[PDB]
Amino acid sequence: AKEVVLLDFAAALGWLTHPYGKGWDLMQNIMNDMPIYMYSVCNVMSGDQDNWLRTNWVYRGEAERIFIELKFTVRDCNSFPGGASSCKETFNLYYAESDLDYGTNFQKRLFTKIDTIAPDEITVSLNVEERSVGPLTRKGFYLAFQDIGACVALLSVRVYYKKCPELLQGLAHFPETIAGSDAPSLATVAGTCVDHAVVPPGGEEPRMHCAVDGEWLVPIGQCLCQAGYEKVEDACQACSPGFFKFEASESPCLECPEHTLPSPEGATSCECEEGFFRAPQDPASMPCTRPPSAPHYLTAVGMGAKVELRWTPPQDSGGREDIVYSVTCEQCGPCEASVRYSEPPHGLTRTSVTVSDLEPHMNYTFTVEARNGVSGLVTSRSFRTASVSINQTEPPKVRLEGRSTTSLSVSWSIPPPQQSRVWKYEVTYRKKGDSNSYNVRRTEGFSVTLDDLAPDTTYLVQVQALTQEGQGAGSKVHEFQTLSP
């Protein structure tokens, strides 16, 4: 775990002693053909000791919490001739922040005690200890060591801050970040997106925290490979030629779908080969599709004035499920509003419709076309046709125009446009009650007189305009009556 050092006594500076002369004092020994320095003080006999040793001004840089490591020795208070109660076996560690170098202007009251330092190993004619303080927030700081009446040898001091390693995590890159001072107040570090990577709409953007111990803590958000690109190891390559990636996801590059042209490197979509198309609604994931073929077959059986257009889906959906049917009509020329559709005629999803109100004696032709969500792209037409004529025309209006004791003058009417079909007019009559005797005569006229009948009798008259045989339209059964003398 990287550590940045701000002050290292061992490598070596002549620090400030107070008071000067007595108290702390730089000293030297010999080892491995090399000089060894140390600040010592051994005033155990003397009743009251208050010896201060101050380190020169250390720059804080951007360090937030510093770690102080000390290596020292301590003699046993029981080994000195005096060795009275005036001998301690510990010393005190202080610090102070400032924006300028006080130089020689050392002032005890300005210092904050960090802790007392006690020997792990006491000797008789080396203890290692570490502490830390934060947060620091000024240009520089001092360290101060206080003697209270012991025999101490200070061999080493190191003050450093911990640091978080640079890394790449989820396509994001974070840089060396100074570790934080306190956990409850841990800042957040933004990461930047590797080439060809991005943060999608709208996920969390890359973040991570540098903990006191110099460790990366809680990873937030992530970067994904931009469209046209895919993740390989910890980088983003372009999609191979023949593949595509429309949205920035975690998935790999997909191969082009059906009916598409081989894509160039780093493709976000495969264009569709001539003959096929895609709708706006269509995702670039589905294959380009085609317009449908006309309905497979079409029937139109007309029960009276209504009719039943049944039909079946195209033999070729064009590769879609959004096929809708449209129905028009011929009467020549287009039908008016005269015809009623059981349902709206255009934009149908069913495969059968009932139209009604068809004036007899006219064959209409209905056309049904099938189209899908891609028909609007081409100007062709794919439809089926079916025609029907109802011959039932038309319930004649009967009424009399003359009466006698024995004869009835009967006449019927019917619009000229329909007087064409009518092959012959069948006239039927019989006395009331009688059901074993029928009187029937035919004619092309619109009037007839019934001869040789009984007086004061109601007759049943039924006229039927045949078209041509057994397929004609009957009339209301009227009731007329002879006259009395």
Ligand SMILES: *[C@H]1O[C@H](CO)[C@@H](O)[C@H](O)[C@H]1NC(C)=O
């Ligand atoms: C419909 O009338 C036409 C004349 O427009 C005729 O050719 C045809 O036979 C009729 N319908 C049928 C059942 O063929």
Ligand SMILES: [Cl-]
């Ligand atoms: Cl602290």
